[PDB]
Amino acid sequence: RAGVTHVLSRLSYISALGMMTRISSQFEKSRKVSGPRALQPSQFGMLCTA
Amino acid sequence: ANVTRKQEDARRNPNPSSQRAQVVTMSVKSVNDPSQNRLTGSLLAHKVADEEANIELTWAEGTFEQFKDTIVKEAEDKT
Amino acid sequence: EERDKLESDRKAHTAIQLKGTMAIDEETMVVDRHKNAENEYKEKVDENPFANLYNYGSYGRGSYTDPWTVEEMIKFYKALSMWGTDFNLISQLYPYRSRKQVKAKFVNEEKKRPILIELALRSKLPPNFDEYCCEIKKNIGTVADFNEKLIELQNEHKHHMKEIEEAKNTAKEEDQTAQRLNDANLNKK
Amino acid sequence: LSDNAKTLHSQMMSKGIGALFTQQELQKQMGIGSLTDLMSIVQELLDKNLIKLVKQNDELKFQGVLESEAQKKATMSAEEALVYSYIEASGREGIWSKTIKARTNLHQHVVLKCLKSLESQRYVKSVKSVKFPTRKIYMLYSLQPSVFTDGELDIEFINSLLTIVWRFISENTFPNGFKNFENGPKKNVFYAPNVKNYSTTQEILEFITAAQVANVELTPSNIRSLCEVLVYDDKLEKVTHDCYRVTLESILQMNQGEGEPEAGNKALEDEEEFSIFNYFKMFPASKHDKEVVYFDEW
DNA sequence: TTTTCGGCTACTATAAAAAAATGTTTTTTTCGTTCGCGAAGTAACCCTTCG
DNA sequence: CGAAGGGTTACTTCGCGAACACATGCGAAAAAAACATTTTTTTATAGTAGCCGAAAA
């Protein structure tokens, strides 16, 4: 498993809050359109849509 | 039938040579120190299917025993 | 503690028949798959509390001694008047001391006293009570040089006869193997 | 032991050549269940172990030795007599170290201390093979199998026996001293080479029987056949049965010593292929294209 | 019943040439996250021929 | 008239790529052999592990 962690960016307090609470994935580098790239309607309150 | 045909095909074969004469039961092994283990319960219900079997007879007349003694038990139950 | 905390001697033997059973007793060897299976035994016996102690500074060899008995000293002067500087016999003559500590006792008694030791080497007493003490306090047989020499010669003769019989049996087995090889060569053609 | 008299019963039934009929009689004498129980106890008292076959139960094997004693060689451990019983029934050649590693799934230094503690009382008397793939050693006694009459015979007396059988077949299938010079060789060979024309036909083993050194030199006409195969693939033709025909290189390298001196008869033809003598090219002299031509490290 | 301060026991170290019984580290044999297109092994069916 | 000798189209499995910049021979049983330990002979010397008696209450 490569790329588990990350050095803590302190550009702002928003950076230190938003680099946490991050959902990384397994489909990291694959050029597929409308697959695991377009967000789904089951995200109302679950994850941020923007 | 299928095991019987394979045993009959394995009958009178010359492949069991003179190793059958010097068969020894001296193959006692130590307990499974951290190398690989025994069967150990994963197939014990699969293994015990030929060790014993009971011949249980038919019933054909049983009416009194599991009907009237059940009501006699209510005479000593008393709520 | 085996009586307290807990048959119980569930162990193995020199043979394969270990348990209970040697095998199945119904028709044939049934428990040979279980008899062929050491590290499952009785060990939950000796329970003792812990500590955080130490043994450092110097640990290993040493000498646990005491202030010596003056009656042991009188016995030592009587022994040296009777049977002198005989380190192994002196270590056996006191059979609850040891060897290096009585050697330090030898050099200590060689240090301080010339008079009684000179009179002791003057005395030349014959060793009978020393053998009396060595045969009672140890209960050793002390068979003489003729009996022990004859027993050693008989053991050497028995060992030589066993070696000669083993060599003759090996030669007979080699001759039987050569005859069996000749018979196999005759039966191969 | 001293349980009951059934140890003496086991000795009396294991005196002669035994089989399953001996155990049939032993179960036939008294009532069956007490006999089975006490026989299981006697087999738990370091005795013969049963054998699983098509037949019910067999003995192991025919003798009443009964020597393991389970506690007394130098120390007390219930692991050593086990390993001794493992090397009792090794068989013909022996047992590997990897085989005894594979069984009982133990460590290897306990096998080394078994080696030492049993070598301290002479039960590790091994027999060595010719080759050593995985140390096929440590049998019981007598150095019996030896896989070795010509295999373990290296090296000098194989050459000595080869030289003397070459001399004997050269003096049998051809006359003795007519290979030295060309002054009428062999006299119209074997007197107009017809029906005399003989060879050994077991006479070579009779000549071996005339003289040996008595170590490995009793060959049952098979090591002689092995040396026969060793000689007809280099310098003998051997038309079908036993007619050797030693010639076409025997004369040259037999009579080169004190039979072919200097100042001969005639100069030789260029590039005689069947000739190894007088081929030298340099004191140092390797300047130009002399005989330095062959294969040139391609 | 508690502590402390003086008597013995004695083993480490270096140096000696003395020589024997026994245990101590390297080697030579053997092996268990696409998709699209182009090219290369095994079958189903005709053209032709001898016994 | 039927078995056999090429001869090809058809199904299946194996080789490459995807932007464009930036600043982040190895392992594992043993085997001949060159070798030290381990002595005991003191023995000078300090003290450091462990052991009881004259001192105070």
PDB file of N, CA and C in Angstrom, chain B:
ATOM      1  N   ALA B   1     -20.965 -48.501  -4.994  1.00  0.00           N
ATOM      2  CA  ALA B   1     -20.638 -49.081  -6.295  1.00  0.00           C
ATOM      3  C   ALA B   1     -19.380 -48.462  -6.895  1.00  0.00           C
ATOM      4  N   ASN B   2     -19.248 -47.133  -6.822  1.00  0.00           N
ATOM      5  CA  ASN B   2     -18.090 -46.473  -7.415  1.00  0.00           C
ATOM      6  C   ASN B   2     -16.806 -46.779  -6.652  1.00  0.00           C
ATOM      7  N   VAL B   3     -16.867 -46.873  -5.322  1.00  0.00           N
ATOM      8  CA  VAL B   3     -15.690 -47.274  -4.558  1.00  0.00           C
ATOM      9  C   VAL B   3     -15.388 -48.758  -4.780  1.00  0.00           C
ATOM     10  N   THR B   4     -16.425 -49.585  -4.966  1.00  0.00           N
ATOM     11  CA  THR B   4     -16.226 -51.009  -5.225  1.00  0.00           C
ATOM     12  C   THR B   4     -15.559 -51.253  -6.576  1.00  0.00           C
ATOM     13  N   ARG B   5     -15.936 -50.489  -7.607  1.00  0.00           N
ATOM     14  CA  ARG B   5     -15.312 -50.664  -8.918  1.00  0.00           C
ATOM     15  C   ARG B   5     -13.865 -50.186  -8.920  1.00  0.00           C
ATOM     16  N   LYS B   6     -13.561 -49.104  -8.192  1.00  0.00           N
ATOM     17  CA  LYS B   6     -12.174 -48.650  -8.104  1.00  0.00           C
ATOM     18  C   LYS B   6     -11.320 -49.592  -7.266  1.00  0.00           C
ATOM     19  N   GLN B   7     -11.904 -50.230  -6.247  1.00  0.00           N
ATOM     20  CA  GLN B   7     -11.155 -51.216  -5.476  1.00  0.00           C
ATOM     21  C   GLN B   7     -10.944 -52.501  -6.271  1.00  0.00           C
ATOM     22  N   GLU B   8     -11.927 -52.890  -7.087  1.00  0.00           N
ATOM     23  CA  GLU B   8     -11.773 -54.061  -7.944  1.00  0.00           C
ATOM     24  C   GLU B   8     -10.778 -53.799  -9.067  1.00  0.00           C
ATOM     25  N   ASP B   9     -10.698 -52.555  -9.546  1.00  0.00           N
ATOM     26  CA  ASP B   9      -9.641 -52.193 -10.482  1.00  0.00           C
ATOM     27  C   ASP B   9      -8.289 -52.112  -9.787  1.00  0.00           C
ATOM     28  N   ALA B  10      -8.278 -51.768  -8.500  1.00  0.00           N
ATOM     29  CA  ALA B  10      -7.068 -51.782  -7.687  1.00  0.00           C
ATOM     30  C   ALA B  10      -6.778 -53.150  -7.088  1.00  0.00           C
ATOM     31  N   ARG B  11      -7.561 -54.164  -7.442  1.00  0.00           N
ATOM     32  CA  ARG B  11      -7.309 -55.526  -7.005  1.00  0.00           C
ATOM     33  C   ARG B  11      -6.316 -56.189  -7.958  1.00  0.00           C
ATOM     34  N   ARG B  12      -5.518 -57.119  -7.404  1.00  0.00           N
ATOM     35  CA  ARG B  12      -4.486 -57.938  -8.084  1.00  0.00           C
ATOM     36  C   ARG B  12      -3.508 -57.104  -8.924  1.00  0.00           C
ATOM     37  N   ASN B  13      -3.234 -55.869  -8.486  1.00  0.00           N
ATOM     38  CA  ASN B  13      -2.302 -55.013  -9.210  1.00  0.00           C
ATOM     39  C   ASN B  13      -0.865 -55.232  -8.727  1.00  0.00           C
ATOM     40  N   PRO B  14       0.117 -55.178  -9.631  1.00  0.00           N
ATOM     41  CA  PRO B  14       1.513 -55.407  -9.234  1.00  0.00           C
ATOM     42  C   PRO B  14       2.218 -54.190  -8.654  1.00  0.00           C
ATOM     43  N   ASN B  15       1.570 -53.026  -8.618  1.00  0.00           N
ATOM     44  CA  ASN B  15       2.171 -51.816  -8.063  1.00  0.00           C
ATOM     45  C   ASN B  15       2.397 -51.877  -6.546  1.00  0.00           C
ATOM     46  N   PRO B  16       1.522 -52.526  -5.713  1.00  0.00           N
ATOM     47  CA  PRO B  16       1.967 -52.819  -4.341  1.00  0.00           C
ATOM     48  C   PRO B  16       3.000 -53.933  -4.294  1.00  0.00           C
ATOM     49  N   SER B  17       4.269 -53.560  -4.463  1.00  0.00           N
ATOM     50  CA  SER B  17       5.401 -54.482  -4.423  1.00  0.00           C
ATOM     51  C   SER B  17       5.778 -54.832  -2.988  1.00  0.00           C
ATOM     52  N   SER B  18       6.994 -55.346  -2.787  1.00  0.00           N
ATOM     53  CA  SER B  18       7.461 -55.903  -1.514  1.00  0.00           C
ATOM     54  C   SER B  18       7.550 -54.920  -0.341  1.00  0.00           C
ATOM     55  N   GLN B  19       7.143 -53.660  -0.541  1.00  0.00           N
ATOM     56  CA  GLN B  19       6.988 -52.722   0.567  1.00  0.00           C
ATOM     57  C   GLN B  19       5.890 -53.153   1.537  1.00  0.00           C
ATOM     58  N   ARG B  20       4.932 -53.968   1.077  1.00  0.00           N
ATOM     59  CA  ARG B  20       3.851 -54.442   1.937  1.00  0.00           C
ATOM     60  C   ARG B  20       4.334 -55.417   3.006  1.00  0.00           C
ATOM     61  N   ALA B  21       5.484 -56.060   2.799  1.00  0.00           N
ATOM     62  CA  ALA B  21       6.007 -56.982   3.802  1.00  0.00           C
ATOM     63  C   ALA B  21       6.570 -56.226   4.998  1.00  0.00           C
ATOM     64  N   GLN B  22       7.428 -55.238   4.746  1.00  0.00           N
ATOM     65  CA  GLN B  22       8.054 -54.457   5.810  1.00  0.00           C
ATOM     66  C   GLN B  22       7.247 -53.179   6.019  1.00  0.00           C
ATOM     67  N   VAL B  23       6.022 -53.355   6.503  1.00  0.00           N
ATOM     68  CA  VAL B  23       5.169 -52.251   6.929  1.00  0.00           C
ATOM     69  C   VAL B  23       5.331 -52.112   8.435  1.00  0.00           C
ATOM     70  N   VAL B  24       5.726 -50.932   8.877  1.00  0.00           N
ATOM     71  CA  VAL B  24       5.956 -50.670  10.289  1.00  0.00           C
ATOM     72  C   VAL B  24       5.014 -49.573  10.762  1.00  0.00           C
ATOM     73  N   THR B  25       4.534 -49.720  11.992  1.00  0.00           N
ATOM     74  CA  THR B  25       3.684 -48.728  12.641  1.00  0.00           C
ATOM     75  C   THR B  25       4.476 -47.953  13.687  1.00  0.00           C
ATOM     76  N   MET B  26       5.746 -47.696  13.386  1.00  0.00           N
ATOM     77  CA  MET B  26       6.645 -46.971  14.270  1.00  0.00           C
ATOM     78  C   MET B  26       6.637 -45.469  14.014  1.00  0.00           C
ATOM     79  N   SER B  27       5.625 -44.954  13.321  1.00  0.00           N
ATOM     80  CA  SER B  27       5.634 -43.590  12.791  1.00  0.00           C
ATOM     81  C   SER B  27       5.025 -42.582  13.751  1.00  0.00           C
ATOM     82  N   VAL B  28       5.222 -42.771  15.056  1.00  0.00           N
ATOM     83  CA  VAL B  28       4.717 -41.849  16.072  1.00  0.00           C
ATOM     84  C   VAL B  28       5.427 -40.501  15.910  1.00  0.00           C
ATOM     85  N   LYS B  29       4.646 -39.425  15.932  1.00  0.00           N
ATOM     86  CA  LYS B  29       5.125 -38.076  15.680  1.00  0.00           C
ATOM     87  C   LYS B  29       4.936 -37.229  16.935  1.00  0.00           C
ATOM     88  N   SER B  30       5.809 -36.241  17.109  1.00  0.00           N
ATOM     89  CA  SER B  30       5.690 -35.314  18.222  1.00  0.00           C
ATOM     90  C   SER B  30       4.491 -34.383  18.034  1.00  0.00           C
ATOM     91  N   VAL B  31       4.116 -33.719  19.131  1.00  0.00           N
ATOM     92  CA  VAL B  31       3.031 -32.745  19.118  1.00  0.00           C
ATOM     93  C   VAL B  31       3.455 -31.538  18.278  1.00  0.00           C
ATOM     94  N   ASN B  32       2.475 -30.864  17.666  1.00  0.00           N
ATOM     95  CA  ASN B  32       2.716 -29.846  16.643  1.00  0.00           C
ATOM     96  C   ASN B  32       3.324 -28.592  17.268  1.00  0.00           C
ATOM     97  N   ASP B  33       4.633 -28.670  17.502  1.00  0.00           N
ATOM     98  CA  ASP B  33       5.484 -27.511  17.714  1.00  0.00           C
ATOM     99  C   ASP B  33       5.420 -26.619  16.466  1.00  0.00           C
ATOM    100  N   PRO B  34       5.666 -25.238  16.599  1.00  0.00           N
ATOM    101  CA  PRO B  34       5.008 -24.238  15.714  1.00  0.00           C
ATOM    102  C   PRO B  34       4.925 -24.444  14.199  1.00  0.00           C
ATOM    103  N   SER B  35       5.617 -25.439  13.641  1.00  0.00           N
ATOM    104  CA  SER B  35       5.320 -25.910  12.293  1.00  0.00           C
ATOM    105  C   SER B  35       3.904 -26.505  12.218  1.00  0.00           C
ATOM    106  N   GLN B  36       3.508 -26.854  10.990  1.00  0.00           N
ATOM    107  CA  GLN B  36       2.115 -27.036  10.581  1.00  0.00           C
ATOM    108  C   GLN B  36       1.400 -28.133  11.376  1.00  0.00           C
ATOM    109  N   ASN B  37       0.080 -27.981  11.472  1.00  0.00           N
ATOM    110  CA  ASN B  37      -0.724 -28.609  12.510  1.00  0.00           C
ATOM    111  C   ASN B  37      -1.375 -29.883  11.962  1.00  0.00           C
ATOM    112  N   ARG B  38      -2.236 -30.504  12.767  1.00  0.00           N
ATOM    113  CA  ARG B  38      -2.942 -31.735  12.439  1.00  0.00           C
ATOM    114  C   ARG B  38      -4.280 -31.344  11.792  1.00  0.00           C
ATOM    115  N   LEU B  39      -5.211 -32.292  11.649  1.00  0.00           N
ATOM    116  CA  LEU B  39      -6.563 -31.975  11.197  1.00  0.00           C
ATOM    117  C   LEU B  39      -7.271 -31.066  12.199  1.00  0.00           C
ATOM    118  N   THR B  40      -7.406 -31.541  13.443  1.00  0.00           N
ATOM    119  CA  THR B  40      -7.774 -30.765  14.635  1.00  0.00           C
ATOM    120  C   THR B  40      -9.157 -30.111  14.483  1.00  0.00           C
ATOM    121  N   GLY B  41     -10.168 -30.979  14.435  1.00  0.00           N
ATOM    122  CA  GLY B  41     -11.546 -30.579  14.634  1.00  0.00           C
ATOM    123  C   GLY B  41     -12.231 -29.915  13.454  1.00  0.00           C
ATOM    124  N   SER B  42     -11.494 -29.545  12.405  1.00  0.00           N
ATOM    125  CA  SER B  42     -12.127 -28.890  11.265  1.00  0.00           C
ATOM    126  C   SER B  42     -12.934 -29.872  10.426  1.00  0.00           C
ATOM    127  N   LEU B  43     -12.582 -31.159  10.474  1.00  0.00           N
ATOM    128  CA  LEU B  43     -13.273 -32.193   9.713  1.00  0.00           C
ATOM    129  C   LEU B  43     -13.648 -33.388  10.580  1.00  0.00           C
ATOM    130  N   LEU B  44     -13.791 -33.190  11.894  1.00  0.00           N
ATOM    131  CA  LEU B  44     -14.110 -34.305  12.782  1.00  0.00           C
ATOM    132  C   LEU B  44     -15.528 -34.806  12.539  1.00  0.00           C
ATOM    133  N   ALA B  45     -16.461 -33.890  12.271  1.00  0.00           N
ATOM    134  CA  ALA B  45     -17.798 -34.300  11.857  1.00  0.00           C
ATOM    135  C   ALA B  45     -17.787 -34.903  10.460  1.00  0.00           C
ATOM    136  N   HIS B  46     -16.804 -34.535   9.635  1.00  0.00           N
ATOM    137  CA  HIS B  46     -16.638 -35.178   8.338  1.00  0.00           C
ATOM    138  C   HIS B  46     -15.895 -36.502   8.456  1.00  0.00           C
ATOM    139  N   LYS B  47     -15.020 -36.641   9.456  1.00  0.00           N
ATOM    140  CA  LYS B  47     -14.282 -37.888   9.622  1.00  0.00           C
ATOM    141  C   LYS B  47     -15.144 -38.972  10.254  1.00  0.00           C
ATOM    142  N   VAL B  48     -15.920 -38.633  11.282  1.00  0.00           N
ATOM    143  CA  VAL B  48     -16.716 -39.646  11.965  1.00  0.00           C
ATOM    144  C   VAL B  48     -17.977 -39.879  11.142  1.00  0.00           C
ATOM    145  N   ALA B  49     -17.880 -40.796  10.182  1.00  0.00           N
ATOM    146  CA  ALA B  49     -19.034 -41.267   9.434  1.00  0.00           C
ATOM    147  C   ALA B  49     -18.964 -42.757   9.137  1.00  0.00           C
ATOM    148  N   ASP B  50     -17.944 -43.460   9.633  1.00  0.00           N
ATOM    149  CA  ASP B  50     -17.798 -44.889   9.407  1.00  0.00           C
ATOM    150  C   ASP B  50     -17.382 -45.621  10.678  1.00  0.00           C
ATOM    151  N   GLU B  51     -17.169 -44.905  11.784  1.00  0.00           N
ATOM    152  CA  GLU B  51     -16.607 -45.516  12.983  1.00  0.00           C
ATOM    153  C   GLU B  51     -17.628 -46.378  13.721  1.00  0.00           C
ATOM    154  N   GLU B  52     -18.866 -45.904  13.863  1.00  0.00           N
ATOM    155  CA  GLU B  52     -19.906 -46.715  14.483  1.00  0.00           C
ATOM    156  C   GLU B  52     -21.257 -46.368  13.873  1.00  0.00           C
ATOM    157  N   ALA B  53     -22.199 -47.301  14.019  1.00  0.00           N
ATOM    158  CA  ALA B  53     -23.560 -47.130  13.523  1.00  0.00           C
ATOM    159  C   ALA B  53     -24.478 -48.049  14.313  1.00  0.00           C
ATOM    160  N   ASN B  54     -25.641 -47.537  14.709  1.00  0.00           N
ATOM    161  CA  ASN B  54     -26.596 -48.316  15.484  1.00  0.00           C
ATOM    162  C   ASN B  54     -27.786 -48.731  14.627  1.00  0.00           C
ATOM    163  N   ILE B  55     -28.273 -49.947  14.863  1.00  0.00           N
ATOM    164  CA  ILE B  55     -29.443 -50.472  14.156  1.00  0.00           C
ATOM    165  C   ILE B  55     -30.637 -50.249  15.080  1.00  0.00           C
ATOM    166  N   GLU B  56     -31.442 -49.242  14.757  1.00  0.00           N
ATOM    167  CA  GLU B  56     -32.620 -48.909  15.544  1.00  0.00           C
ATOM    168  C   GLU B  56     -33.868 -49.424  14.835  1.00  0.00           C
ATOM    169  N   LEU B  57     -34.692 -50.172  15.562  1.00  0.00           N
ATOM    170  CA  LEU B  57     -35.826 -50.859  14.963  1.00  0.00           C
ATOM    171  C   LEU B  57     -37.004 -49.904  14.769  1.00  0.00           C
ATOM    172  N   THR B  58     -38.056 -50.417  14.135  1.00  0.00           N
ATOM    173  CA  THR B  58     -39.255 -49.643  13.857  1.00  0.00           C
ATOM    174  C   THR B  58     -40.117 -49.526  15.109  1.00  0.00           C
ATOM    175  N   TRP B  59     -41.119 -48.652  15.038  1.00  0.00           N
ATOM    176  CA  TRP B  59     -41.979 -48.451  16.196  1.00  0.00           C
ATOM    177  C   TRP B  59     -43.240 -49.313  16.147  1.00  0.00           C
ATOM    178  N   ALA B  60     -44.125 -49.049  15.183  1.00  0.00           N
ATOM    179  CA  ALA B  60     -45.232 -49.893  14.725  1.00  0.00           C
ATOM    180  C   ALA B  60     -46.338 -50.188  15.741  1.00  0.00           C
ATOM    181  N   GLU B  61     -46.149 -49.861  17.033  1.00  0.00           N
ATOM    182  CA  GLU B  61     -47.213 -50.137  17.996  1.00  0.00           C
ATOM    183  C   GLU B  61     -47.276 -49.096  19.120  1.00  0.00           C
ATOM    184  N   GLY B  62     -46.426 -48.072  19.105  1.00  0.00           N
ATOM    185  CA  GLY B  62     -46.288 -47.211  20.265  1.00  0.00           C
ATOM    186  C   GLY B  62     -47.345 -46.136  20.403  1.00  0.00           C
ATOM    187  N   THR B  63     -48.271 -46.312  21.342  1.00  0.00           N
ATOM    188  CA  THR B  63     -49.362 -45.367  21.551  1.00  0.00           C
ATOM    189  C   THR B  63     -49.407 -44.838  22.976  1.00  0.00           C
ATOM    190  N   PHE B  64     -49.128 -45.688  23.964  1.00  0.00           N
ATOM    191  CA  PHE B  64     -49.362 -45.354  25.366  1.00  0.00           C
ATOM    192  C   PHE B  64     -48.282 -44.439  25.935  1.00  0.00           C
ATOM    193  N   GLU B  65     -47.027 -44.635  25.509  1.00  0.00           N
ATOM    194  CA  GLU B  65     -45.875 -44.168  26.279  1.00  0.00           C
ATOM    195  C   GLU B  65     -45.724 -42.651  26.236  1.00  0.00           C
ATOM    196  N   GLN B  66     -45.705 -42.061  25.042  1.00  0.00           N
ATOM    197  CA  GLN B  66     -45.536 -40.621  24.907  1.00  0.00           C
ATOM    198  C   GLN B  66     -46.868 -39.886  24.815  1.00  0.00           C
ATOM    199  N   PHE B  67     -47.955 -40.524  25.239  1.00  0.00           N
ATOM    200  CA  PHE B  67     -49.262 -39.886  25.290  1.00  0.00           C
ATOM    201  C   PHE B  67     -49.836 -39.841  26.696  1.00  0.00           C
ATOM    202  N   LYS B  68     -49.817 -40.958  27.425  1.00  0.00           N
ATOM    203  CA  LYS B  68     -50.470 -40.984  28.728  1.00  0.00           C
ATOM    204  C   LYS B  68     -49.544 -40.527  29.851  1.00  0.00           C
ATOM    205  N   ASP B  69     -48.247 -40.849  29.756  1.00  0.00           N
ATOM    206  CA  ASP B  69     -47.274 -40.380  30.743  1.00  0.00           C
ATOM    207  C   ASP B  69     -47.138 -38.862  30.720  1.00  0.00           C
ATOM    208  N   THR B  70     -47.376 -38.248  29.558  1.00  0.00           N
ATOM    209  CA  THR B  70     -47.409 -36.794  29.456  1.00  0.00           C
ATOM    210  C   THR B  70     -48.544 -36.198  30.285  1.00  0.00           C
ATOM    211  N   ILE B  71     -49.697 -36.867  30.316  1.00  0.00           N
ATOM    212  CA  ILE B  71     -50.814 -36.384  31.121  1.00  0.00           C
ATOM    213  C   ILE B  71     -50.591 -36.709  32.600  1.00  0.00           C
ATOM    214  N   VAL B  72     -49.928 -37.834  32.892  1.00  0.00           N
ATOM    215  CA  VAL B  72     -49.582 -38.192  34.270  1.00  0.00           C
ATOM    216  C   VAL B  72     -48.588 -37.187  34.861  1.00  0.00           C
ATOM    217  N   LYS B  73     -47.721 -36.611  34.019  1.00  0.00           N
ATOM    218  CA  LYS B  73     -46.812 -35.555  34.465  1.00  0.00           C
ATOM    219  C   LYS B  73     -47.567 -34.303  34.917  1.00  0.00           C
ATOM    220  N   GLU B  74     -48.739 -34.039  34.328  1.00  0.00           N
ATOM    221  CA  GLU B  74     -49.569 -32.920  34.766  1.00  0.00           C
ATOM    222  C   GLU B  74     -50.211 -33.161  36.126  1.00  0.00           C
ATOM    223  N   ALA B  75     -50.307 -34.419  36.565  1.00  0.00           N
ATOM    224  CA  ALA B  75     -50.857 -34.698  37.886  1.00  0.00           C
ATOM    225  C   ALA B  75     -49.881 -34.320  38.991  1.00  0.00           C
ATOM    226  N   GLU B  76     -48.583 -34.274  38.687  1.00  0.00           N
ATOM    227  CA  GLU B  76     -47.587 -33.855  39.661  1.00  0.00           C
ATOM    228  C   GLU B  76     -47.056 -32.453  39.400  1.00  0.00           C
ATOM    229  N   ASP B  77     -47.325 -31.881  38.224  1.00  0.00           N
ATOM    230  CA  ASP B  77     -46.938 -30.501  37.947  1.00  0.00           C
ATOM    231  C   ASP B  77     -47.667 -29.518  38.857  1.00  0.00           C
ATOM    232  N   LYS B  78     -48.997 -29.442  38.702  1.00  0.00           N
ATOM    233  CA  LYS B  78     -49.893 -28.597  39.507  1.00  0.00           C
ATOM    234  C   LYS B  78     -49.473 -27.127  39.487  1.00  0.00           C
ATOM    235  N   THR B  79     -49.455 -26.545  38.284  1.00  0.00           N
ATOM    236  CA  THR B  79     -49.057 -25.154  38.000  1.00  0.00           C
ATOM    237  C   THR B  79     -47.684 -24.786  38.563  1.00  0.00           C
TER     238      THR B  79
END
